[PDB]
Design an enzyme around this catalytic site. Sequence first.
Site, short mmCIF file in Angstrom:
data_model
loop_
_atom_site.label_atom_id
_atom_site.label_comp_id
_atom_site.label_asym_id
_atom_site.label_seq_id
_atom_site.Cartn_x
_atom_site.Cartn_y
_atom_site.Cartn_z
N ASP A 152 0.70 -1.08 -0.02
CA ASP A 152 -0.03 0.25 0.05
C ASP A 152 0.84 1.40 -0.02
O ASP A 152 2.06 1.23 0.36
CB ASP A 152 -0.76 -0.18 1.31
CG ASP A 152 -1.57 1.45 1.43
OD1 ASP A 152 -2.34 1.69 0.53
OD2 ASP A 152 -1.88 1.78 2.60
N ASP A 188 -7.21 -2.40 3.22
CA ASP A 188 -6.37 -3.67 3.00
C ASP A 188 -6.65 -4.80 3.76
O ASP A 188 -5.75 -6.06 3.67
CB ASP A 188 -4.96 -3.07 3.53
CG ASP A 188 -4.70 -1.78 2.89
OD1 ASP A 188 -4.36 -1.74 1.46
OD2 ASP A 188 -4.19 -0.71 3.64
F1 ALF Z 1 -3.74 5.04 -0.02
AL1 ALF Z 1 -3.98 3.53 0.04
F2 ALF Z 1 -4.21 1.61 -0.04
F3 ALF Z 1 -4.09 3.42 -1.71
F4 ALF Z 1 -3.75 3.37 2.10
MG LIG Z 2 -2.98 3.74 3.81
#
Ligand code: ALF
Ligand SMILES: [Mg+2]
EC number: 7.2.2.10
Lengths: 939, 214
Positions: free
Chosen positions: A350, A675
């Site tokens: 991420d 996530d």
């Molecule tokens: F900003 Al994200 F998964 F894309 F935490």
């Molecule tokens: Mg994030």
Amino acid sequence: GCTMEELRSLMELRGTEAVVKIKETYGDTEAICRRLKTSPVEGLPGTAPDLEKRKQIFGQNFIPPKKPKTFLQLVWEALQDVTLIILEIAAIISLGLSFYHPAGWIEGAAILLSVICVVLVTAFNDWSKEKQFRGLFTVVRAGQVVQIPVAEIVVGDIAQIKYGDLLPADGLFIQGNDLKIDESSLTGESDQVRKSVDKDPMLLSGTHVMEGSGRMVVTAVGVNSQTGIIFTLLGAKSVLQGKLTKLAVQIGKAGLVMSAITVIILVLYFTVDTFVVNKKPWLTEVYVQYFVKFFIIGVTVLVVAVPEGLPLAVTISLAYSVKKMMKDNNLVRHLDACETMGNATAICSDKTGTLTTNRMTVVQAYVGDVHYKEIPDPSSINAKTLELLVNAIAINSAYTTKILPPEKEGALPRQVGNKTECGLLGFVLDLRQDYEPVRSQMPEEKLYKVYTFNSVRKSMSTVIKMPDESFRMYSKGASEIVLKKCCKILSGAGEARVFRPRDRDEMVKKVIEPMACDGLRTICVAYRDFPSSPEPDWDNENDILNELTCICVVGIEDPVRPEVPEAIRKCQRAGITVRMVTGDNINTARAIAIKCGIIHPGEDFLCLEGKEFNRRIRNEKGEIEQERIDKIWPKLRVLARSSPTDKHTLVKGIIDSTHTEQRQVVAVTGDGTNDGPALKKADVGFAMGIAGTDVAKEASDIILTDDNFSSIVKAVMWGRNVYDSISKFLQFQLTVNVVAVIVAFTGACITQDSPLKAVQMLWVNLIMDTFASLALATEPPTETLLLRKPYGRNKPLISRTMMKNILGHAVYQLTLIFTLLFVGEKMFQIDSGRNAPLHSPPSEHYTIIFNTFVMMQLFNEINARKIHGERNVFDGIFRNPIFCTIVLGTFAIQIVIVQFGGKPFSCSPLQLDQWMWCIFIGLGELVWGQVIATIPTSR
Amino acid sequence: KPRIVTSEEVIIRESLLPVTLQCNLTSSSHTLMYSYWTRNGVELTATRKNASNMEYRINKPRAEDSGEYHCVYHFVSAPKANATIEVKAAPDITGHKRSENKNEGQDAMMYCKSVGYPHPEWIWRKKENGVFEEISNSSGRFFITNKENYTELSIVNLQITEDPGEYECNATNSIGSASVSTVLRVRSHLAPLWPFLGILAEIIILVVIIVVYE
Ligand code: ALF
Ligand SMILES: [Mg+2]
Ligand SMILES: *[C@@H]1O[C@H](CO)[C@@H](O)[C@H](O)[C@H]1NC(C)=O
Ligand SMILES: *[C@@H]1O[C@H](CO)[C@@H](O)[C@H](O)[C@H]1NC(C)=O
Ligand SMILES: *[C@@H]1O[C@H](CO)[C@@H](O)[C@H](O)[C@H]1NC(C)=O
Ligand SMILES: *[C@@H]1O[C@H](CO)[C@@H](O)[C@H](O)[C@H]1NC(C)=O
Ligand SMILES: *[C@@H]1O[C@H](CO)[C@@H](O)[C@H](O)[C@H]1NC(C)=O
Ligand SMILES: *[C@@H]1O[C@H](CO)[C@@H](O)[C@H](O)[C@H]1NC(C)=O
């Protein structure tokens, strides 16, 4: 009216792409309300048949949990292991034959005890894992305001949303007053989104109302809303464990075959011999006690063959390793997770929070006509300029934004207001100059003409009138708007000089362009002091907004963590491929990917958005097919604008793929709710400790307690050590069980007497070998483990060096034990224990055999410290107090067992020189080890 | 004195035929109340009845059955009569030690037990150069302590030069004879020194290899 799946598919659209769609299909929102037979003004009738029919069609707002498995049922599942079943059957028949008198119950009872150990441990492990994932009220629900529980909401309801509320279900926006929502639970970005019918009417479940009020119409209610999808994808053994289970099963069935052959050979030989020589009458009196003794011998071969205490040894090694890993800021939540990251071939990461600090920060500066790629020193520039800049930012702010203490351990200050303004508020403090009393000098009551957010130019300006009647103007805004309206650059301590094109065109392409190519937003600040007559009409401002005095231009970004690039470079040297899967737009994703090292500007990779990814992996009937994922995933590096379902789909496709001939083990790092699914699907998941979002914490296997990416590198190396430790035990234990069998078989055939008993070997397999495992687990890891390729997901588990060591040491042990059996009474000048009568007292011959066996294994614990071809097996042995303590304790317990064990252990006490000869023979194993370490395994 | 006619004495051979022993009270003016059988002075179970004429049967005569049996008649006002029948068998040695291992300077004990009647004569012997020869007490240390069915040969202050050997015990009766053998082993005082030196060799070898390897 509309079917459930239609509305569910509608609720997967965002932004203007939704708006047009609605207008095409279902007109305006007041029509789609009619199609659901509901009235925005009236509300919902509330009649029971209507409510129940709606709940039947569209489902209910309640998800029933999954009840957890009980300890008793885990014990019942542990009892169904085949290796345990054969041992329970052996113990039962042993206790049975014991009571055929025409303390023999010890042996069988001991076997049962060993089983009762293993089960009680195995179940316990399965219990604790279950306990880690266990975690995984009233709303105004009508036009006529009635507080109703969230479980009672149905599709078609009219709900009212205010500040602080948490949305219960997906819906559409009828009317409101300046809604701003925080959708970080779905995208991972903590930005306020403005909800209006023309711009964006979609409201989603689980998001938090930051500002405004309004009313909504509920469209998806239960497991069909976004939070319902997330919790459906969260459910609500291992690679090494599977390898170990397969090996244990095949060793157990080899043991069964050997025991059966032993019994049938004994019976056949007895029959043939007797009916050749004696030819006695066929009365079956004798003729039964022989068969009982043959079955006892056959049970002994089985007991010595199988490794009864292998789960115990693996558990204790893994527990020690987890305890040690805790010092590297890796909190491992369950045991078998400490190995997986050693053999991982891919990481899906991420972006925001994980690879960046998630704080809007001024990184570059243009003040005093000197470019600052780094923040300057305090008082390194004109003090008048510094004071003017601080006052400009502070007063121009004039808004509720403030900076706050971390409130946590090792956390960054929390920015509560708008991101950009908090960036400058933190910049002034990063100049080591405090701003808190400066603003407090002027309360917002003593304030004047202000236009906020200036939707015309998006540039926010204020006026302030303390110094004199000459009122002072402070204006900040985007460079593209504000720069050309400026007329003076204050350079150094010198007074502000006039500029124009060729006096502002040189900074362009020398200052602005590098900043924009670094992925930096550019914000510039300017001021005026004019004593003109007060004209604060809010309508006569165009003439005012010229002849600015531009003090500085700054660059604001969400910066990469300091240690990320080097950690990623180390991870790539270890044979791991790193991919970015983010919920942010593709420009920021690609810029951060270039800075982090994920993509090198070679331009041979794929960067995609979620829409193209979803479309390109589907057939004509719109269902996912693996063969289309196998084209995208090998060269994909950046995936942007991805939902939780896209992250889950990508990790599932990588895991299931059979391409590339090297089957994949996938790790996932993240800190957000979105996530959660992928962290669960991954072979190993890492959650950021301080930046929790607890759902990501219960979904993960390992927690990084310091939000340090370098810890992941320490998790690879540790995971490559744990593997090694277990293959040190397998080399040790498999050398025992082989030798024992070949001794128990041969002794049964020739002497028919069982030189190694069953309790004698339940001491060795159960108690002695688990402490051998713990002793062999205690070498500390080094970074030289990061220099080797990941092992295969289906590699054998027993290498060629391990085979060479097992066979080369079994040769020595077998030749010496057979020499002792056949010519031992002459050497030691004692009398033989061979072909002993029925229920005879123990012997010194066979006690010497048992004691020698145990001494050889005790001194082979040292030889088992090297699984590659190193000679020096003593390297670091005296530095390790656990190893020495365990070896000495085993020696002392063996002395006590031989001297005071009595008949239960089948031991008769030995003299001093007999003990010295046992130790001499056992210590010759360290010399045989140096002999066979010479043989190159490449032959 | 009442008159008892008894059966003839019986020699138990390897035959499995049952043996019956008889007592007849041929002359008695006293009112008997009971009678009972005894072996070596110990009353046999379930042998008390009227039994003015009484019988005892052995289905499986063995050496342990042989002995000096008596058939006692107890009268109202007369002394008991204990007329006695002997049951002769060859001696059978039912106990010895397979081997006796001791350190020099200690004392050793060897024993033999037998089952037979009459109680056997005991003689000890030692195998010298293939032939068993009588014990020679020139040292003064040997202590034979023969008994009715037990015998011991005890040695004090064992010497490692001559004492180690094989000793046979012989039990003899008019019927037959039985002999069993024991092995005596004396251990040297410097016994734990030879392994210890060997250990000191092994360690040294190990050290050299590593010290040469690095
Ligand atoms: F900003 Al994200 F998964 F894309 F935490
Ligand atoms: Mg994030
Ligand atoms: C001795 O007693 C037995 C058993 O009753 C009898 O058969 C036998 O005739 C008796 N002998 C004499 C001489 O009385
Ligand atoms: C056996 O019974 C007879 C007949 O009464 C009697 O004369 C004799 O004394 C008895 N013998 C015993 C009781 O020993
Ligand atoms: C019976 O008395 C006589 C008296 O001389 C004695 O010798 C014999 O030992 C006695 N029998 C038993 C069994 O005691
Ligand atoms: C052997 O001689 C010693 C000398 O005192 C004596 O005590 C012992 O009884 C003798 N033993 C035999 C069997 O002659
Ligand atoms: C040997 O004599 C002893 C003397 O009390 C006696 O206890 C033991 O039962 C006898 N053993 C045999 C086999 O006669
Ligand atoms: C010693 O025992 C053997 C076997 O029992 C026997 O043949 C021999 O006659 C015995 N020696 C004697 C009685 O002197």
